[PDB]
From Swiss-Prot, chains A, C, D:
Subunit annotation: The subunits circularize to form a toroid; DNA passes through its center. Replication factor C (RFC) is required to load the toroid on the DNA. Homotrimer. Interacts with NucS.
One Pfam family it belongs to: PCNA_C
GO molecular function, one term: DNA binding
Protein name: DNA polymerase sliding clamp
Disulfide bonds: none
Record gene name: pcn
UniProt cross-references to InterPro entries, sorted A to Z: DNA_clamp_sf, Pr_cel_nuc_antig, Pr_cel_nuc_antig_C, Pr_cel_nuc_antig_CS, Pr_cel_nuc_antig_N
Gene Ontology BP annotations: leading strand elongation; regulation of DNA replication
Keyword RNA-binding applies: no
Length: 246, 55, 246, 246
């Protein structure tokens, strides 16, 4: 029996879309600290970790702690119906429904039957990540879209003070180098030579929904999963975990 | 190797066969497929190009 | 043998589209008073009533009164080829053609063979309409688009000083309330409790082509057809008549 | 073993698209004077003549003269990945690859295996062209799009101080007249009565990619091919040669 009030519903709908393009259902671990999400793709190739501290909400009213079970598709269509500045509200009382209130010029109320979600909890804390880089959003977004031309597996190469991406197909070759000197490369933390490869499809699901004013974190090691991260209103950030190939 | 052999690159598509039904299942050389596509002529099960007409 | 000159061809093409999305052919009762249209869907579920007083036209030249018979599809493609401010002209002489002249940066002339239309005239004057409400365009447009999510039949409920819309499907529930206090509800004229249901498809055909700066009239009674109306350049307004369900 | 530096990669990609929509492969006769292109459709109905004087390039470094053979499709996808102001670079050394360097916010390197092109050279110099007209781009673009409604063969009629286009199908009729008095008709050079017809499809492939600020030249005679032309950065212009019908 809670209520929640979040402003800028279009943003929240965007991020919920982001989580949506990989999994179809998911549960929301609502605690008085904040709203939490954590789930994995069907393929067991990517891990979506959503963290929402209550501070971000214009109002945050939780009485206890409970897990919501919702159809990410239905919620995605619903939240997608919100716009730029209309206010979002999330209410839940006794009954087994979630009430979404979009109030901008007017109030609109939706109800979503909650669905049971068999939870498979796999918490994966910090791991041996050789290199760690921060980079503007549109840099990586452009890059992935480029590797979409020539292949389906994008290879990452992290060298001392230099970050380079690349991909090769049958005859076409794609390369994207950039270093700290370059503008888009905000930071590089080189411990040593790192190299990996990742499913360009999964990356495309990842980086869609990124403007130029989007900073992204990338930790990873030689032939091991990437962990991507980026903040949301500077408090609650999302983190993906992508297993490499080969 | 086909485009290398016959010197043709600008094929919109090259529709193939889902599965050889011949006994040997020996496949036609791809070059001929490229030339068909380049001129836009279709093939029939023996490798010849036919043209039905009420006689 | 007339000629007509209307400015803002894109607008007129928009409204002709509006009429277009329900019927495929129709006749234009041109009189020296003005251009008139009136027809009904194939399904006999909606009635489109177009009224065009001659005043709206920058020039209006009718010699007598005659009925045009045109393919709404062909006219729709034609008028759709006009743009924002280019001038529209409609000419007809002896021959059985309609000449459409789009002159903006240049003049362009089209000719449309007129088609005979078997006229089935059903004039339906004022009827017992319990409630009558005015509302901004985008309010209803958003609302219908919302009811598109959960069902195919949108239910309307008019209570004293309060207008509420709703729709329910298998699981989900959609509700849109608003009153005179709310901004988008310009007026309410409550005689008593009114309730109806209507085909969400037909409504979608109706309200498409409505900006926020669009006022709409809605008269209706308990389990009986709605009549919607909205003005066009403040003189000639269009009116739809939608039979309810059940 | 050359290198080339051209600014405004999006423009160049646009024109390369223009050439792309008619032919699938082509060779680039690079000379120390400049980059040249010349090829004909499969149908032998249109002739694309590209002329690029070296002056247009921010840097132009050719050592000798050689012919490039490239997949217009692959190059089209590649160049299409450039944007508004990012810088284009074209490099070629010993190996049989072309290196495309898109450097805006960052540098991105692509490699394209060059392909042998059986060259069929048909140079067609000035020919007996009765009429010759200059006209704004969007005029002809609108016009062709209009003739797309009623027919597949657009007829051109050039009379003294007057240029008129038209097309007729089963029923409908389309006409577009304009003269020197009109704004969009920059020039007319009438030697005598000219009339022709052309494939509306081919014209649509031609005029796509034309803003209002685009001047176009048109030379042609009674029942003979059109030659269209338009400049690119005021130095290197493109010229199409379209055979008439009937």
């Amino acid at each position: 029996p809670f209520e929640i009030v979040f402003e800028g519903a279009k943003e929240f709908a965007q991020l919920i879309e982001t989580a949506s393009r990989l999994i179809d259902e998911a549960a929301f671990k609502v605690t008085e600290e904040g709203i939490s999400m954590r789930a994995m793709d069907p393929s067991r190739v990517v891990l979506i970790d959503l963290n929402l501290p209550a501070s971000i909400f214009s109002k945050y009213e939780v009485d206890g702690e409970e897990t919501i079970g919702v159809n990410m598709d239905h919620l995605k269509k619903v939240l997608k119906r919100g716009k730029a500045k209309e206010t979002l509200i999330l209410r839940k009382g006794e009954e087994n429904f979630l009430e979404i209130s979009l109030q901008g010029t007017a109030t609109r109320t939706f109800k979503l039957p909650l669905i049971d979600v068999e939870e498979i909890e796999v918490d994966l804390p910090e791991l041996p990540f050789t290199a760690k880089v921060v980079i503007l959003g549109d840099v990586i977004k452009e890059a992935v879209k480029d590797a979409s031309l020539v292949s389906d597996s994008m290879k990452f190469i992290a060298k001392e003070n230099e970050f380079t991406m690349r991909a090769e197909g049958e005859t076409q070759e794609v390369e994207v180098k950039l270093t700290l000197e370059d503008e888009g490369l905000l930071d590089i933390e080189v411990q040593e030579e790192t190299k990996s490869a990742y499913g360009i499809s999964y990356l495309s699901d990842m980086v869609k929904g990124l403007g130029k004013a989007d900073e992204v974190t990338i930790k990873f090691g030689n032939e091991m999963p990437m962990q991507m991260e980026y903040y949301i209103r500077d408090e609650g950030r999302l983190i993906f975990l992508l297993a490499p190939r080969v | 190797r086909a485009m290398e052999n016959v010197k043709v690159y600008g094929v919109d598509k090259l529709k193939g066969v889902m599965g050889m039904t011949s006994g040997w299942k020996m496949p036609e050389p791809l070059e001929k497929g490229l030339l068909r596509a380049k001129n836009d002529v279709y093939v029939f099960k023996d490798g010849t190009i036919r043209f039905d007409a009420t006689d």
